[PDB]
């Protein structure tokens, strides 16, 4: 009845050090379409995140595409938390510039 | 541009 | 080449928080082009691509129209469903719909759509004949027999077949810079080791459009299907997406492994190997 949602936390454009760019969260697979997303970095919650209209794929699951502008550095740190009914507790994914 | 209104047929 | 237009209504129950919302997105491709909420402060129909900028006030009205009206009838069809399948009035459901037009290489109807589904689960759906459905279960059923006695397939098929093909051929002249333009991905492969005897090879595909892609991995010419990790493409968010596949293999083989890659904008498939 329900399913829970994919993660995947990157940038828009190549990670490079000082240069703003693009931080994205992209929940999908979801069901169903109710689900909290927040961009956080160094563990605080991102003032004006923007998101996509919700949508379905052919399974119907839902997906979403949550954004802000950012300034990749060597210390900040940003992540994706995401809570879903399907979720225990708010699940964490850190953004891996490899990934 | 979407499916016109039509009859307005509810499930 | 081919082209689709899509348009997909997500209409969601909550009781105790206000009356169902109804949310209504229309794709050309994988390019979104408008956007109807009824939850928004004023609810009204949204450009959310530059070529549709320029469609007349006539256009935006009759839009709204049809999505406030289906905002009332979804609402109708919820609390019918919800009796379907004798359900109490305390839970949340959503209704979703999807339905739209595709078109061959040439222009011309390849075949229409139009599928419901009921809390994720495929209720009913117009078959390919664009004539008769196929109703899920005996809760389907009921709407089916509502629609055949409102020629509701006729409807559709008229729709389909006109409407639908009309204004997708439009859409496509007016935004054929960019729905007729196939950005071909950007690629290469990445070297992580994970010990001291095997290592990650992961090909990268960036900034292409449509999303469709074909990326695969193979040893000494042989798919490693079973062996790869292929994410689900995702969104850059400038209209392209991304996609990479993966793959762990033994430090000192990674030239046995080639990543192939498919996609509309090349000019000729891709063979990619790792470049220390």
Redesign the interface.
Same mark, same amino acid.
């Given at each position: 009845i329900q399913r829970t949602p994919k993660i995947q936390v990157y940038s828009r454009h190549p990670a490079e050090n000082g240069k703003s760019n693009f931080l994205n969260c992209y929940v999908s697979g979801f069901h169903p379409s109710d689900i909290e997303v927040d961009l956080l970095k160094n563990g605080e919650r991102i003032e004006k995140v923007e998101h996509s209209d919700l949508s379905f794929s052919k399974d119907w699951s839902f997906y979403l595409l949550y954004y802000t502008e950012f300034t990749p550095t060597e210390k900040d740190e940003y992540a994706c938390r995401v809570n879903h009914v399907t979720l225990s507790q708010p699940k964490i994914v850190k953004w891996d510039r490899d990934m | 541009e979407p499916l016109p209104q039509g009859q307005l047929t509810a499930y | 080449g081919s082209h689709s237009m899509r348009? #997909?209504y997500?209409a969601?129950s909550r009781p105790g928080r206000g009356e169902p919302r109804f949310?209504?997105?229309?794709?050309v491709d994988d390019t979104?082009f408008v956007?109807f &909420?009824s939850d928004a402060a004023s609810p009204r129909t949204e450009p959310?691509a530059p070529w549709i900028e320029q469609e007349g006030p006539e256009?935006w009205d009759r !839009?709204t129209? =049809? #999505?406030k009206?289906?905002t009332?009838?979804?609402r109708?069809?919820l609390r !019918?469903?919800r009796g379907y399948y004798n359900q109490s009035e305390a839970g949340?459901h959503? =209704?979703?719909r999807?339905?739209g037009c595709d078109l061959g290489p040439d222009g011309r109807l390849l075949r229409g759509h139009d599928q419901?589904?009921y &809390? +994720?689960? &495929?209720? =009913?759906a117009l078959n390919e004949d664009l004539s008769s459905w196929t109703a899920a279960d005996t809760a389907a059923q009921i709407?089916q027999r509502?629609?055949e006695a409102?020629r509701?397939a006729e409807?559709?098929r008229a729709?389909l077949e006109g409407?639908?093909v009309?204004?997708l051929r439009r859409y496509l002249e007016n935004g054929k810079e960019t729905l007729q333009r196939a950005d071909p991905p950007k690629t290469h492969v990445?070297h992580?080791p994970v010990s001291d005897h095997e290592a990650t090879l992961?090909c990268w595909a960036?900034g292409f459009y449509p999303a469709e892609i074909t990326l695969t991995w193979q040893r000494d010419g042989e798919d490693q299907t079973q062996d790869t990790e292929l994410?689900?493409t995702?969104?850059? +968010? &400038?209209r392209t997406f991304?996609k990479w596949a993966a793959v762990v293999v033994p430090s000192g083989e990674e030239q046995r492994y080639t990543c192939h890659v498919q996609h509309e904008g090349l000019p000729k498939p891709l063979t990619l190997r790792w470049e220390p």
């Open positions: - | - | 348009y #997909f997500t969601m949310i209504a997105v229309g794709y979104q956007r &909420d959310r256009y !839009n129209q =049809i #999505f009206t289906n009332q009838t979804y109708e069809s !019918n469903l949340s959503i =209704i979703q999807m339905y419901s589904a &809390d +994720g689960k &495929d209720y =009913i709407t509502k629609w409102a509701v409807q559709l729709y409407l639908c009309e204004w990445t992580h992961r960036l994410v689900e995702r969104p850059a +968010g &400038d991304q």
